[PDB]
Amino acid sequence: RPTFYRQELNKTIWEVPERYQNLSPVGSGAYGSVCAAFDTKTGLRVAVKKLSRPFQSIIHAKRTYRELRLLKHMKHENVIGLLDVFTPARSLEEFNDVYLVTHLMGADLNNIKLTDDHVQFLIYQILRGLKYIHSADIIHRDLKPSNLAVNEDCELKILDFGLATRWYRAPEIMLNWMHYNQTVDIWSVGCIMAELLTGRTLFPGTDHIDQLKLILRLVGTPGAELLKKISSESARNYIQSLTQMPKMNFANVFIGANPLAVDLLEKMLVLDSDKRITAAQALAHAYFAQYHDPDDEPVADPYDQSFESRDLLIDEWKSLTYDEVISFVPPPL
Ligand SMILES: Clc1cc(-c2ccncc2)c(-c2ccc3ccccc3c2)nn1
Ligand SMILES: Fc1ccc(-c2n[nH]cc2-c2ccncc2)cc1
Ligand SMILES: [Zn+2]
């Protein structure tokens, strides 16, 4: 076992191995807290996340397990992965804190306007990561700029997969459709790409209602083919009761942008999710001709999510998480 040292940073106790030095607070979301640090063993800059109250309830315990399982499975250059995972606890009985470690990323996409060349590379990387994620039957569901880490080199990694946000959400979701597919993520990517090209949020709704109205203004109210797939009687009334609007001409709305970028946007921002382009198909779009390499856009190993339907005690989830910490084997340097 390694030697741990303790310190207090921002009213948070940090107890980690000696190998990680010079902890410095980066930010504190609700998920947990993060510090940048230096890993003496590898000479690398890393980010260490300390989970907040990981076993405070069934919800939290299952969430802690879900995140650890998912992070241990993601091995892709465009998806945040695990360099290490540890606990100061020496037994299950004492186990109450979880620490996750990954490569330190200097910024996010919100912190940029961009050349068409930079938009191509950044969206390319997002899709390449999504292809991998989607291949494992995982859906991100909350893609947005702040979930995309980027370094000075413009290398990008997707954070918080399968774990206003409303601005990047697919319409089927705030219609409360409970059978949405993986292309909910493609809608988000389309919102992101548009914003990188124009420098403006595409659909800055103030609430769920307004958000839908901004969306239909651009892509038009639903056609009869899409109307037939809506079961909710409520949803139909609301939708059919709206002032029917036509799909706008994207070449006009995004006038000045690379026509190839416009073509892709049109394929991503389709109201009917069954017609949206997939990540794999998007990667082969002529817009990414300079980066697309079919032999270097890998898929993931099968991912076992059966635990999602289990109803267990906090201690059972806690125990399962303990097991995942112990069985962890770091990736080759
Ligand atoms: Cl908004 C945000 C940023 C980071 C982060 C910041 C800087 N560099 C890398 C990540 C992590 C974060 C920080 C540390 C992590 C460690 C292991 C697994 C995931 C992790 C996620 N979460 N959320
Ligand atoms: F106004 C809209 C906006 C989006 C949709 C939609 N797109 N893909 C799936 C749906 C959908 C929404 C609600 N119920 C079934 C299907 C349907 C109507
Ligand atoms: Zn480089």
Short mmCIF file of all heavy atoms in Angstrom, two decimals, residues 19 30 35 48 81 102 115 133 136 140 164 166 185 192 218 222 238 247 253 265 272 300 304 307 330:
data_model
loop_
_atom_site.label_atom_id
_atom_site.label_comp_id
_atom_site.label_asym_id
_atom_site.label_seq_id
_atom_site.Cartn_x
_atom_site.Cartn_y
_atom_site.Cartn_z
N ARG A 19 2.78 10.13 -4.07
CA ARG A 19 3.13 10.29 -5.47
C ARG A 19 2.49 11.54 -6.08
O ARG A 19 3.09 12.13 -6.98
CB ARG A 19 2.77 9.11 -6.39
CG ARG A 19 1.32 8.69 -6.36
CD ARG A 19 1.03 7.55 -7.31
NE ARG A 19 1.12 7.88 -8.74
CZ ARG A 19 0.73 7.02 -9.67
NH1 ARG A 19 0.29 5.83 -9.31
NH2 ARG A 19 0.76 7.31 -10.95
N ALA A 30 -21.02 19.85 -8.32
CA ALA A 30 -21.83 19.14 -7.34
C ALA A 30 -21.40 17.67 -7.29
O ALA A 30 -21.57 17.01 -6.27
CB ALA A 30 -23.30 19.31 -7.64
N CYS A 35 -8.79 18.90 -8.11
CA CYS A 35 -7.51 19.57 -7.92
C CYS A 35 -6.54 19.15 -9.01
O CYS A 35 -6.58 18.02 -9.47
CB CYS A 35 -6.77 19.19 -6.64
SG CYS A 35 -7.47 19.86 -5.10
N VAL A 48 -7.30 15.42 -10.17
CA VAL A 48 -7.76 14.47 -9.18
C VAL A 48 -9.15 14.90 -8.74
O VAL A 48 -9.34 16.01 -8.27
CB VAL A 48 -6.82 14.37 -7.98
CG1 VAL A 48 -7.31 13.39 -6.92
CG2 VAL A 48 -5.41 14.00 -8.42
N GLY A 81 -10.53 9.28 -19.43
CA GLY A 81 -10.30 7.96 -18.87
C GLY A 81 -9.53 8.02 -17.55
O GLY A 81 -9.12 9.10 -17.11
N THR A 102 -7.06 11.55 -13.77
CA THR A 102 -6.99 11.55 -15.24
C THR A 102 -5.95 12.60 -15.66
O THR A 102 -5.42 13.33 -14.80
CB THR A 102 -8.36 11.83 -15.86
OG1 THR A 102 -8.31 11.50 -17.25
CG2 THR A 102 -8.83 13.25 -15.60
N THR A 115 -11.70 29.31 -36.67
CA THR A 115 -11.53 29.12 -38.11
C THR A 115 -12.34 27.89 -38.48
O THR A 115 -12.65 27.05 -37.63
CB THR A 115 -10.06 28.94 -38.48
OG1 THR A 115 -9.36 30.10 -38.03
CG2 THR A 115 -9.84 28.78 -39.97
N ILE A 133 -18.28 5.70 -27.77
CA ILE A 133 -19.26 5.67 -26.69
C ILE A 133 -20.53 4.94 -27.15
O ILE A 133 -21.02 4.02 -26.46
CB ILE A 133 -19.53 7.11 -26.20
CG1 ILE A 133 -18.25 7.69 -25.54
CG2 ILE A 133 -20.71 7.15 -25.23
CD1 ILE A 133 -18.35 9.14 -25.09
N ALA A 136 -20.78 1.18 -27.48
CA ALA A 136 -20.91 0.38 -26.27
C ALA A 136 -22.33 0.46 -25.71
O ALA A 136 -22.59 0.06 -24.57
CB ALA A 136 -19.89 0.87 -25.25
N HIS A 140 -24.57 9.72 -24.04
CA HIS A 140 -24.05 10.74 -23.15
C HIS A 140 -25.23 11.43 -22.46
O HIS A 140 -25.32 11.48 -21.23
CB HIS A 140 -23.16 11.72 -23.92
CG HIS A 140 -22.42 12.66 -23.04
ND1 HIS A 140 -23.07 13.61 -22.28
CD2 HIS A 140 -21.14 12.67 -22.62
CE1 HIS A 140 -22.19 14.24 -21.52
NE2 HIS A 140 -21.00 13.70 -21.73
N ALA A 164 -27.40 27.21 -19.86
CA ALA A 164 -28.39 26.15 -19.54
C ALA A 164 -28.08 24.90 -20.36
O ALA A 164 -27.73 25.00 -21.54
CB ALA A 164 -29.80 26.66 -19.77
N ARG A 166 -30.15 22.86 -21.11
CA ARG A 166 -31.32 22.79 -21.96
C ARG A 166 -30.98 23.29 -23.38
O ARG A 166 -31.58 22.81 -24.32
CB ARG A 166 -32.50 23.64 -21.46
CG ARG A 166 -32.44 25.14 -21.72
CD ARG A 166 -33.72 25.89 -21.36
NE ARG A 166 -33.95 26.10 -19.93
CZ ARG A 166 -33.29 26.98 -19.18
NH1 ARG A 166 -32.39 27.79 -19.71
NH2 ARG A 166 -33.49 27.00 -17.87
N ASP A 185 -27.48 12.65 -28.85
CA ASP A 185 -26.14 13.24 -28.74
C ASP A 185 -25.75 13.98 -30.02
O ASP A 185 -25.00 14.96 -29.97
CB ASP A 185 -25.12 12.18 -28.37
CG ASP A 185 -25.24 11.63 -26.95
OD1 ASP A 185 -25.84 12.32 -26.10
OD2 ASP A 185 -24.85 10.45 -26.75
N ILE A 192 -23.61 22.50 -30.87
CA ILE A 192 -22.24 22.89 -30.57
C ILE A 192 -21.53 23.38 -31.82
O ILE A 192 -20.94 24.46 -31.83
CB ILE A 192 -21.49 21.71 -29.92
CG1 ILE A 192 -22.12 21.37 -28.53
CG2 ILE A 192 -20.01 21.99 -29.80
CD1 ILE A 192 -21.57 20.13 -27.85
N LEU A 218 -36.54 27.02 -36.44
CA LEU A 218 -35.49 26.75 -37.41
C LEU A 218 -35.79 25.51 -38.25
O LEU A 218 -35.66 25.54 -39.46
CB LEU A 218 -34.17 26.50 -36.69
CG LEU A 218 -33.00 26.10 -37.59
CD1 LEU A 218 -32.67 27.19 -38.60
CD2 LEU A 218 -31.79 25.76 -36.75
N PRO A 222 -43.28 19.60 -36.75
CA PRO A 222 -43.24 18.23 -37.26
C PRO A 222 -44.11 17.90 -38.47
O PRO A 222 -45.25 18.33 -38.55
CB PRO A 222 -43.80 17.41 -36.11
CG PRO A 222 -43.40 18.21 -34.90
CD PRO A 222 -43.60 19.64 -35.31
N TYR A 238 -50.50 19.78 -27.91
CA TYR A 238 -49.61 20.92 -27.80
C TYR A 238 -48.98 21.25 -29.16
O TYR A 238 -49.07 22.38 -29.63
CB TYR A 238 -48.57 20.71 -26.70
CG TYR A 238 -47.71 21.96 -26.62
CD1 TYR A 238 -48.09 23.04 -25.82
CD2 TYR A 238 -46.57 22.09 -27.40
CE1 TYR A 238 -47.34 24.20 -25.79
CE2 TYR A 238 -45.81 23.26 -27.38
CZ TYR A 238 -46.20 24.31 -26.57
OH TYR A 238 -45.45 25.45 -26.53
N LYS A 247 -39.69 24.56 -42.29
CA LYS A 247 -38.27 24.39 -42.08
C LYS A 247 -37.57 25.54 -42.79
O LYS A 247 -37.91 25.87 -43.92
CB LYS A 247 -37.76 23.05 -42.62
CG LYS A 247 -36.28 22.79 -42.31
CD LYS A 247 -35.73 21.42 -42.69
CE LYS A 247 -35.82 21.09 -44.14
NZ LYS A 247 -35.02 22.03 -44.94
N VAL A 253 -29.65 30.77 -43.36
CA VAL A 253 -29.44 31.02 -41.95
C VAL A 253 -27.96 31.03 -41.57
O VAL A 253 -27.58 31.79 -40.69
CB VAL A 253 -30.21 29.97 -41.14
CG1 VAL A 253 -29.86 30.07 -39.67
CG2 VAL A 253 -31.72 30.05 -41.39
N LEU A 265 -24.79 20.17 -40.75
CA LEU A 265 -25.73 20.71 -39.77
C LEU A 265 -27.14 20.28 -40.09
O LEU A 265 -27.91 19.94 -39.18
CB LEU A 265 -25.69 22.24 -39.65
CG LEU A 265 -24.48 22.81 -38.91
CD1 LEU A 265 -24.53 24.33 -38.97
CD2 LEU A 265 -24.51 22.31 -37.49
N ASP A 272 -36.89 14.59 -36.49
CA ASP A 272 -37.12 13.16 -36.32
C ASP A 272 -35.79 12.45 -36.09
O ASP A 272 -35.00 12.31 -37.01
CB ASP A 272 -37.86 12.61 -37.53
CG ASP A 272 -38.22 11.13 -37.50
OD1 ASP A 272 -37.75 10.41 -36.58
OD2 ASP A 272 -39.05 10.74 -38.33
N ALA A 300 -15.72 0.31 -29.07
CA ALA A 300 -15.45 -0.22 -27.75
C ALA A 300 -15.85 -1.68 -27.60
O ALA A 300 -16.72 -2.20 -28.28
CB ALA A 300 -16.24 0.59 -26.73
N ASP A 304 -21.34 -4.07 -20.17
CA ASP A 304 -22.36 -4.71 -19.36
C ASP A 304 -23.06 -3.70 -18.44
O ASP A 304 -22.55 -3.39 -17.37
CB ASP A 304 -21.69 -5.73 -18.45
CG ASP A 304 -22.57 -6.55 -17.53
OD1 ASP A 304 -23.82 -6.49 -17.66
OD2 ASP A 304 -21.98 -7.18 -16.63
N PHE A 307 -26.42 -3.91 -14.36
CA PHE A 307 -26.55 -3.44 -12.98
C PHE A 307 -27.56 -2.30 -12.89
O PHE A 307 -28.16 -2.08 -11.83
CB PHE A 307 -25.24 -2.91 -12.40
CG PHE A 307 -24.81 -1.57 -12.97
CD1 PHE A 307 -25.27 -0.39 -12.39
CD2 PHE A 307 -23.91 -1.48 -14.04
CE1 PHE A 307 -24.87 0.84 -12.88
CE2 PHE A 307 -23.54 -0.24 -14.53
CZ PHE A 307 -24.03 0.92 -13.97
N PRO A 330 -3.81 0.08 -13.79
CA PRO A 330 -3.54 1.27 -14.59
C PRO A 330 -3.25 0.95 -16.05
O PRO A 330 -2.83 -0.15 -16.38
CB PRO A 330 -2.32 1.89 -13.93
CG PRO A 330 -1.67 0.71 -13.20
CD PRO A 330 -2.83 -0.12 -12.73
#
